[PDB]
Amino acid sequence: KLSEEQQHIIAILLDAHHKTYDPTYADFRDFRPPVRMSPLSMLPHLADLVSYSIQKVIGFAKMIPGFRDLTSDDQIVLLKSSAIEVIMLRSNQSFTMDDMSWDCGSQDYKYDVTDVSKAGHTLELIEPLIKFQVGLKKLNLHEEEHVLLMAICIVSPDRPGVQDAKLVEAIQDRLSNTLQTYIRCRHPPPGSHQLYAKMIQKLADLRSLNEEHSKQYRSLSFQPENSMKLTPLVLEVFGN
């Protein structure tokens, strides 16, 4: 029934998330403006949105209990291969089922399927991404479950390149138990039915998205004119 340490962790993550995810999306105004006038017209603005996002996810990961104890190189492997996934996960907070899109305080900062298509993305990528957002939303997770899911996604032991898996897995386990115990205590029915199973699954879907949307990246960065319109961080983290 939630130990004191497990409440400690929950509080850490909720605060960490709060310090890394602004609901007013004020900074969005410092991005290169969006253009919906024009192939790839939305590449600069989203490039910047993602780049900004990569940063917040990094700041979020540092506040994950036990993540600091990790080796430097490991910390790199985990963020380098989870970033896209966590961005997609954290983005469910601005995703609305009304018109199926990511609303961020205004129409100008509201991104629909056709705006993502303006960043060089076919439906073979978008279709699944949307299915995801809808499925993840349907879960109606609690902010606690939400921030835990992200953390658990970042500290995954099977990521290629991990050297101290045993240590990483130990970090994950602690987190999973906190979510499982939490789903039992603070989540009533039918709000906690296979709630943990549908979640672990969403992690599998993510891996599938990663694989798919990463290949597209190489297809887009492979052209120097396109690569030229991204940011440094994006090139560093997503490969160069």
Binding site: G59, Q75, I76, E236, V237
Partner: peptide, 11 residues
Amino acid sequence: KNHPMLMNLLK
């Protein structure tokens, strides 16, 4: 591979 920027955001 050397990730100066990612490395700086962590530390």
